[PDB]
Design a protein around this ligand. Structure first.
Ligand SMILES: [Zn+2]
Ligand SMILES: [Zn+2]
Length: 88
């Protein structure tokens, strides 16, 4: 997706704050903090559900052929993560 003011591909940011949505990913304007439009669109509205019944979180590969691809995992923290995995 792209913001509306600028027709530019959004970045995927993570809500780094406190509340019932810390860690939830959202598409936002890709420009520097200045000139950045106020675009904001929750990214996980179409993500798969992990085995807990919760919206999965998207990760990227950080060297081989499948470098750069996206996948989905349980969003709860290694200690309590379920075993859900799915390629995007
Ligand atoms: Zn923008
Ligand atoms: Zn889970």
């Amino acid at each position: 997706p792209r913001c509306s003011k600028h027709n530019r591909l959004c970045i995927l940011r993570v809500v780094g704050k406190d509340g019932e949505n810390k860690g939830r990913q959202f598409y936002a304007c890709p420009l520097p903090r200045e000139a950045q439009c106020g675009f904001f669109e929750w990214a996980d509205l179409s993500f798969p559900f992990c085995n807990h019944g919760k919206r999965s979180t998207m990760k990227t590969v950080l060297i081989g052929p499948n470098n750069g691809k996206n996948f989905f995992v349980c969003p709860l923290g290694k200690e309590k993560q379920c075993n859900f995995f799915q390629w995007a």
